[PDB]
Ligand binder design. Structure first.
Ligand SMILES: CO[C@H]1/C=C/O[C@@]2(C)Oc3c(C)c(O)c4c(O)c(c(/C=N/N5CCN(C)CC5)c(O)c4c3C2=O)NC(=O)/C(C)=C\C=C\[C@H](C)[C@H](O)[C@@H](C)[C@@H](O)[C@@H](C)[C@H](OC(C)=O)[C@@H]1C
Ligand SMILES: [Zn+2]
Lengths: 195, 96, 176, 1126, 49
DNA sequence: CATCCGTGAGTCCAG
DNA sequence: TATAATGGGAGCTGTCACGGATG
């Protein structure tokens, strides 16, 4: 078992030193977004309070070392810094999770990947799509096997840029901007266009 | 931006790799200002580090036009490109 | 002293200066003083007069005191519905509106043609099509090889020539 | 008649005479509890009549547990008493309107006692505004009506379990002591015949170790537990001896890392299990342990804590039950049955109502301010201390605010129909804080327990993943002051049924023997047969002589809930379809006007009244004046009360609550009578649907697979038509570029679009609106950014200067439409109190008069759901002889599979009720109609009847009633004794070859209408992070093409279709824009690019110190629309 | 390691893959769907493509 | 062959 | 920012079936 680890660092010039970090990468802001809602209140990602947690303790370490504090106080901060960077990479892994308001555990970096709601199985193996819809189904004995009854209102929104095309074709609309306004207002023409 | 690339390799990141990625070290815990509602400097949203909030709009406002492209304003050191960059530009924190 | 100072400075996810914290704490203090005095939570108009005598600011203060909420937080009934999944990316570009802009370019390309080379010259000069900047007119006539500011003379020789594609209403549609 | 009590229309009942007791106040589950919390006058009297010695209110209790608050010195002492409310700050109707919380301010008397100075300062403190409950058993939090659901939890106490060993195959006995709040304690028995104990899930140790730690001698261990060999084997294998050595041993295993003093191990063993601070069995926690051990059984409840006597008596209970003993007397205690306990028994399974849930959250808020109190005492000086300075109520107001705002038990009130709300108030949930998770729930928790009889319904429960975890409370059940569920039983002295009734808890019933309700009884009260049907402990049934009958059930319909009892011929439908049928009545929608069903069960009266969505008279009198607006009643004493009608109000679920006056002017009305009724109510009765002319046959495939076929009469006569109101909102805030202003002046809009507005900018009352139109014209100042150099040019030509105001108007959402039936404007200018930053706030209420259409979901009471397949012209309808077209054509195929032939029996009884009948009295009263009550031997056309569940009509009588059916107006009978009738195909003209089952059936219009369910989207809004489309019809989102949905694509081998959906259709930032262009330009679809969501991943791996590089075929790391730099 | 990570035990997969420096040849169904490439099956194979 | 910690435990919808 | 003050506080309760490290 031990060889399976050690031989892996041997082969590829992949140093084992990497398991110890001197600098932690900060994920782009738009991926940890801070948003103002219509209620005036702000909504921010959890990562922002974990990053904030590290830098607050990391800088406090800088002040403590510089002041020449006793090892008892300096070592404490280091332990705190350790748990801080830990709870950033994987929360709940070691010890109790970091709670925010409501005793709610904060999402960590690795929590963005794990399981169902994770970036893999929720956003990559399955995505949401444009040009699509949903409705109640009803038996249609009148239809042939290769047919289906697609609601008039549904089709107009599915084929919306397809219809705008033929509206400016047959001169019902002068441009593409007006053609949109004819489909939105549901003028009687478009039903002839859509068919 | 061709689609066809052959291999996707993963490795154990060096501490030096971390610094090669980052466009600057976050030194403040501060996110934004409480009045201006703008990304405070050397913070988690600092525009010197991650990029402009609005397209081709420099932080201090000395440059507010599409005419300046890739220009690093001297009063706040903000490159002028799309805010599209704030989804791709990295940062880092130097642990003591 | 160190705690309360470091408390006011760090606790806020969005940083407020020390005096601003001194205010809100005074506000919560005068509130709890007027609380037991009126058997009811006091009106903004009432709170204001006692401490700062200004009503507009007290409203503003009470929004500063408001603590933000987390995007990653969810709704209680089901553990799949997170808040950020409802935040519409206001930034993202509308397909039709950007395409309609592109069709506006094809109409101004049918304007650079009917206009002369002198006429389609000052057009892209002070408006800044290829430039991206609007150069001052006293610099435009001197940067261009025709003098006696005849380039401002050609300007009026175009303003009415632009009325014809305007009378064709092919530019009239794209303004509404 | 069935319920001849209030003044209700006559609904004749097939029955055995039910005179035990009327349906109790259905809302008393909510009412009685809140009255205990506040300690209302009506409660203290209710405590008196129940004979409750020294009653303590919900608020009174918290104060006494708290009082007094002293510091470590004992110098200071704060204590509370006498809680009292003022008048409510604002009426209910005003709270719904102004979005404020219906509450009454709470006061208390607090005094600061000081032992040193000997002085006492006493004054009244404000505690905040206290959420009061309506008369309808609801709360109103911020203008939305809410409901507090009762939680089913595991009762505190000591439980014994019998687990079987896998290896040794011997019986191992385990015990577990459960506190209301505190540390854990479980004694278990090994296969090694050595007793062990796990404290708060720490490692196992010999139990004698604990006895020598308590102080008990090693000789007393031999005396008390010597009668077993498993305890002698335990004290023998005992590692160490000595009172000091045991405490040290326990300490060393409990809290490693801390210096063990002889004085520090003695202390925590006292604190972890014997102090009120860290450990606490509730009143139930004490009472339940005591019953199980039988000590201090008579003595009143004073101990809130565990004792040493409890510990020893527990271990004694463990050992005896291990070696086969069946009974045991604890020294100093009465005899107690010894066995293993079923955790799911309703004697051990507890129900905490509204009062306790609020009380608990109150207790939380009090212990918080107590922390601040004990801090504010050591700070300030003794002389200047008043309670006003010590007390911070801010945590209290925040603990009660949060609960109603956040908790999983403060729910949006199910307001589809009056029944929907009624069932919401009587729900029993296991989910929620202090309870269990949905994943944590196994299969035993969910299935039907024997003790559920008469307390909780076994039919009413959700179909989904929540099944078994949520239930309805039974009809006749109520909640006792200890949080358990009682149920009424008739008392039988010696074979003689008495009208004396006693409520029994679950385990109390287990020690007795009960007779089924339908067992034949003498006119005096004696049983008919010696051996009768008898219910016994562990759900076991056997015949037992009448000498042994203790009690008998009140009613046949005792086991069911309120919604369940409204399903005619329930005993004919399998539990599965019967289940849905109960979950679906809640889903019905109020129709323009409502008819009471032709067939009922008698539960339709009391349900509507108790719902509180009808208007009931308080005092008897005469209608002095009636309007559509309000009814004025003149009382006998001379005083006048006036009831204001709710007219066209929007419910929580957008259905239309509309009350109309029943009584005409000058009518003499008695108290408690229905003077005006609301939605889904006809003359004071639950009217969830309409009576429809059914026809059981396959018809041209349009009804295939549970689809439904309708007559156009139902659309031309608004029979299945409903009103739906929406509420649209918008406000004007202060921005950084100025302030949003509501105006009629909107940039680049014709006067044709603005035509339906007023001078303000608001739409005008009575105007009609379509989707996309303007409701409230609001403009906002836009950021002064350099406008387009291509639009600068476009503004010089036409010479039109740009405005700095962008359109931010409130337009009508897609799919919505109707008439504007009222505007509600709030202005900061007109002193209307708004939130900080808002100026003008507008609400527009649009009503839609929706007719029924294809896709709308119709359902009967028997779990027979189905959507509308086709609405034929009225003439196409298979009609009877006299030319009457049927209403609804149900498919035959979907009946005998679902085992719900109750829908059939209702149809048979449905025709009988419509046509009327008359039994043949010549040559006597026929032998089939011999059990038939006299009132039903003759029936009028359009007569209403009752078929109480587990009673009512029998198949014999029903067959007979089909024969008696009166002829139509043309003097011709229409159906036969088979219940069928000949039909003519409205299309071909030829009559159908075989007789078709025809009659009337009660159909409900559920709230699953296509108008709400239909949705589609081309392009729209996109996610902020993943850049994928947003989700939901409300957000104009797209559909999800999930992991499962991709497998189908791959299996097909449709690679390009699959790729397109996951690329240019989804999160290809540049791709989707260019696909739009290529479509409107009639060009070819471009080749997809890199998914922006994949790009997100690599940044998420990178941020985790994972050097991820994309390599080309050569071996060089390439760029992903980005670059690296230090 | 991409197919594996999108399966189960995502944290366990990545720690190992990072250490072993495991290079991924994007030649599989699971692997390709994630990156948006045409799946190496059906109409996606070069024989037909 | 039996314990202790970590990792699994259907989908779409609305909300 | 000079009276003296010196070691925390809520735990969380009803899974289930399995592999790998330890016995
Ligand atoms: C705050 O409470 C929330 C849950 C907390 O969490 C959590 C764990 O504790 C819960 C408790 C204590 C419940 O008693 C409950 C419940 O009784 C119920 C559903 C059913 N959940 N489904 C819903 C979505 N669906 C497609 C899948 C499953 C629930 O989930 C819960 C529920 C939970 O989920 N229903 C039923 O029993 C019956 C059969 C029908 C439902 C009637 C209507 C429809 C609802 O009552 C409406 C009027 C709202 O009131 C609720 C929606 C609440 O929403 C709000 C904000 O008010 C919600 C209960
Ligand atoms: Zn600048």
């Amino acid at each position: 078992k031990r060889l399976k680890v050690v031989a892996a660092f041997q082969q590829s010039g992949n140093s084992p030193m990497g398991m110890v970090l001197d600098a932690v990468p900060v994920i782009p802001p738009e991926l940890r977004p801070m948003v103002q809602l219509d209620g005036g209140r702000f909504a921010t990602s959890d990562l922002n309070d974990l990053y904030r947690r590290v830098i607050n303790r990391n800088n406090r370490l800088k002040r403590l070392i510089d002041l020449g504090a006793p090892e008892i106080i300096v070592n404490n901060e280091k332990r705190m810094l350790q748990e801080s960077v830990d709870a950033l990479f994987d929360n709940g892994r070691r010890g109790r999770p970091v709670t925010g308001p409501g005793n709610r555990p904060l999402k960590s970096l690795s929590d963005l990947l794990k399981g169902k709601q994770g970036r893999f199985r929720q956003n990559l193996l399955g995505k949401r799509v444009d040009y699509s819809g949903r409705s109640v189904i009803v038996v249609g004995p009148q239809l042939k096997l290769h047919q289906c009854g697609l609601p008039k209102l549904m089709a107009l929104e599915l084929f919306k840029p397809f219809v705008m095309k033929r509206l400016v074709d047959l001169n019902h609309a002068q441009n593409i901007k007006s053609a949109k306004r004819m489909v939105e207002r549901q003028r009687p023409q478009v039903w002839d266009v859509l068919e | 931006d061709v689609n066809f690339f052959d291999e996707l390799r993963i490795g154990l990141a060096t501490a030096e790799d971390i610094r090669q990625w980052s466009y600057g070290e976050v030194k403040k815990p501060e996110t934004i200002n409480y009045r201006t509602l703008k990304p405070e400097k050397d913070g988690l949203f600092c525009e010197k580090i991650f990029g402009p909030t609005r397209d081709w709009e420099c932080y201090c406002g000395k440059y507010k036009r599409v005419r300046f492209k890739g220009i690093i304003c001297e009063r706040c050191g903000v490159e002028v490109t799309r805010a599209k960059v704030r989804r791709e530009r990295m940062g880092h924190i130097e642990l003591a | 002293q160190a705690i309360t100072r470091a408390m006011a400075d760090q606790a806020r996810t969005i940083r407020i200066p020390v005096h601003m914290v001194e205010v809100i704490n005074k506000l919560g203090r005068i509130q709890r003083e007027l609380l037991q005095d009126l058997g009811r939570e006091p009106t903004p108009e009432e709170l204001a007069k006692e401490m700062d005598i200004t009503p507009e600011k007290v409203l503003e203060i009470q929004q500063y005191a408001r603590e933000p909420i987390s995007l990653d937080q969810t709704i209680g009934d089901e553990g799949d519905s997170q808040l950020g999944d409802f935040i519409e990316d206001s930034e993202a570009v509308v397909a039709v509106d950007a395409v309609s802009f592109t069709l506006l370019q094809d109409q101004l390309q049918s304007v650079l043609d009917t206009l002369s080379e002198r006429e389609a010259g000052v057009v892209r000069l002070r408006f800044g099509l290829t430039d991206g900047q609007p150069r001052t007119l006293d610099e435009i006539g001197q940067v261009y090889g025709v003098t006696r500011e005849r380039i401002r003379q050609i300007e009026s020789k175009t303003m009415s020539k632009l009325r014809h594609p305007s009378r064709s209403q092919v530019l009239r549609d794209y303004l509404d | 008649s069935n319920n001849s009590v209030p003044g209700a229309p006559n609904r004749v009942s097939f029955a055995k005479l039910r005179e035990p007791l009327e349906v109790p106040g259905l809302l008393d589950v909510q009412t009685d509890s809140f009255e205990w919390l506040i300690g209302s006058p009506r409660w203290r009297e209710s405590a008196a009549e129940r004979g409750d010695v020294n009653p303590v209110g919900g608020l009174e209790e918290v104060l006494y547990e708290l009082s007094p608050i002293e510091d470590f010195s004992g110098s200071m002492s704060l204590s509370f008493s006498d809680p009292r409310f003022d008048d409510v700050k604002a009426p209910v109707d005003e709270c719904k309107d102004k979005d404020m919380t219906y509450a009454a301010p709470l006061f208390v008397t607090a005094e600061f006692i000081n032992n040193n100075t000997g002085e006492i300062k006493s004054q009244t403190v404000f505690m905040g505004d206290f959420p009061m409950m309506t008369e309808k058993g609801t709360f109103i939090i911020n203008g939305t009506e809410r409901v507090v659901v009762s939680q089913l939890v595991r009762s505190p106490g000591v439980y014994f379990d019998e687990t079987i060993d896998k290896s040794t195959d011997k019986t191992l006995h385990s015990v577990k002591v459960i506190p209301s709040r505190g540390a854990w304690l479980e004694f278990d028995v090994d296969k090694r015949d050595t007793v062990g104990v796990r404290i708060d899930r720490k490692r196992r140790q010999p139990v004698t170790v604990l006895l020598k730690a308590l102080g008990w001698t090693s000789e007393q261990i031999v005396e008390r537990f010597g009668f077993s060999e498993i305890m002698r084997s335990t004290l023998e294998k005992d590692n160490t001896v000595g009172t000091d050595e045991a405490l040290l041993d326990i300490y060393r295993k409990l809290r490693p890392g801390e210096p063990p003093t002889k004085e520090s191990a003695q202390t925590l063993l006292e604190n972890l299990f014997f102090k009120e601070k860290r450990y606490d069995l509730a009143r139930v926690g004490r009472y339940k342990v005591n019953k199980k051990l039988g000590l201090h059984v008579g003595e009143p409840i004073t101990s809130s804590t565990l004792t040493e006597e409890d510990v020893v008596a527990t271990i004694e209970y463990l050992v005896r039950l291990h070696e086969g003993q069946t009974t045991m007397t604890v020294p100093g205690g009465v005899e107690v049955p010894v066995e293993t306990d079923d955790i799911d028994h309703f004697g051990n399974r507890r129900l905490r109502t509204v009062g306790e849930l609020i009380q608990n959250q109150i207790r939380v808020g009090m212990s918080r301010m107590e922390r601040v109190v004990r801090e504010r005492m050591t700070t300030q000086d003794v002389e200047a201390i008043t309670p006003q300075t010590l007390i911070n109520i801010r945590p209290v107001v925040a603990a009660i605010k949060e609960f109603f705002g956040t908790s999983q038990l403060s729910q949006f009130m199910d307001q589809n129909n009056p029944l929907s709300g009624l069932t919401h108030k009587r729900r029993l949930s296991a989910l929620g804080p202090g309870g269990l998770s949905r994943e944590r729930a196994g299969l035993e928790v969910r299935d039907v327990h024997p003790s559920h009889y008469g307390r909780m319904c076994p039919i009413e429960t959700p179909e989904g993943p929540n099944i078994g975890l949520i239930g309805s409370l039974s009809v006749y059940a109520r909640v006792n002051p200890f949080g358990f569920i009682e149920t009424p039983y008739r008392k039988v002295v010696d074979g003689v049924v008495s009208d004396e009734i006693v409520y029994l808890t679950a385990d109390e019933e287990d020690r007795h023997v009960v007779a089924q309700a339908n067992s034949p009884i003498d006119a005096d009260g004696r049983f008919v047969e010696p051996r009768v049907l008898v219910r016994r402990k562990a759900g076991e049934v056997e015949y037992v002589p009448s000498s042994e009958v203790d009690y008998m059930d009140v009613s046949p319909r005792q086991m069911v809930s309120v919604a369940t009892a409204m399903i005619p011929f329930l005993e004919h439908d399998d539990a599965n379809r019967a289940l849905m049928g109960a979950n679906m009545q809640r889903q019905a929608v109020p129709l323009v006007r409502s008819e009471a069903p032709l067939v009922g069960t008698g539960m339709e009266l009391r349900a509507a009244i108790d719902a509180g969505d009808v208007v009931v008279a308080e005092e008897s009198g005469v209608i002095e004046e009636v309007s559509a607006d309000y009814i004025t009643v003149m009382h006998d004493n001379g005083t006048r009360r006036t009831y204001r009608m709710r007219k066209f109000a929007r419910s929580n679920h957008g259905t239309c609550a509309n009350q109309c006056p029943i009584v005409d002017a000058g009518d003499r009305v008695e108290a408690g009578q229905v003077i005006a009724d609301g939605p889904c109510t006809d003359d004071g009765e639950m009217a969830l649907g309409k009576n429809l002319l059914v026809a059981i046959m396959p018809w041209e495939g349009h009804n295939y697979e549970d689809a439904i076929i309708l007559s156009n009469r139902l659309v031309e006569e608004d029979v299945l038509t409903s009103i739906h109101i929406e509420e649209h909102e918008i406000d004007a805030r202060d921005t950084k570029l100025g302030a949003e202003e509501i105006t009629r002046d909107i940039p680049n809009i014709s006067d044709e679009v603005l035509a339906d507005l007023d001078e303000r900018g608001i739409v005008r009352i009575g105007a009609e609106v379509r989707d996309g139109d303007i409701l409230v014209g609001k403009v906002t100042p836009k950021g002064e950014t350099e406008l387009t150099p291509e639009e600068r040019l476009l503004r010089a030509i036409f010479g039109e200067k740009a405005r700095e105001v962008r359109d931010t108007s409130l337009k009508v959402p897609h799919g919505e439409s109707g008439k504007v039936i009222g505007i509600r404007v709030f202005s900061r200018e007109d002193e209307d109190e708004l939130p900080a930053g808002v100026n003008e706030l507008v609400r527009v209420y649009v009503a839609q008069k929706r007719k029924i259409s294809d896709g709308d979901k119709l359902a009967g009471r028997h779990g027979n759901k189905g959507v509308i397949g086709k609405i034929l012209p009225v003439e196409d309808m298979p009609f009877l002889a006299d030319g009457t077209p049927v209403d609804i054509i149900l498919n035959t195929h979907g009946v005998p599979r679902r085992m719900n032939i109750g829908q059939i029996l209702e149809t048979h009884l449905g025709w009988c009720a419509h046509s009327g009948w008359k039994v043949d009295a010549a040559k006597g009263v026929p032998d089939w109609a011999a059990r038939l009550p006299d009132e039903l031997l003759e029936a009028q056309p359009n007569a209403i009847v009752s078929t109480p569940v587990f009673d009512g009509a029998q198949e014999a009588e029903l067959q007979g009633l089909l024969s008696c059916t009166l002829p139509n107006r043309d003097g011709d009978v229409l159906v036969d004794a088979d219940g069928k009738a000949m039909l003519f195909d409205g299309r071909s003209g030829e009559p159908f070859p075989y007789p078709v089952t025809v009659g009337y059936m009660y159909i409900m219009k559920l709230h699953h209408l296509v108008d709400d369910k239909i949705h589609a989207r081309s392009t729209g809004p996109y996610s902020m992070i993943t850049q994928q489309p947003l989700g939901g019809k409300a957000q104009f989102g797209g559909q999800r093409f999930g992991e499962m949905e991709c497998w189908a694509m791959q299996a097909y081998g449709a690679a390009y279709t699959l790729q397109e959906l996951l690329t240019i259709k989804s999160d290809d930032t540049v791709g989707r824009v260019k696909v739009y262009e290529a479509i409107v330009k009639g060009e070819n679809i471009p080749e997809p690019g890199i998914p922006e969501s994949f790009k997100v991943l690599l940044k998420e791996l990178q941020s985790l110190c994972l050097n991820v590089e994309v390599l080309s075929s050569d071996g060089a790391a390439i760029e992903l629309r980005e670059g690296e730099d230090e | 390691w991409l197919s594996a990570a999108s399966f189960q035990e995502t944290t366990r997969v990545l720690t190992d893959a990072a250490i072993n420096c495991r290079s991924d040849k994007l030649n599989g169904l699971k692997e390709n769907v994630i990156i948006g490439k045409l799946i190496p099956a059906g109409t996606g194979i070069n024989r037909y493509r």
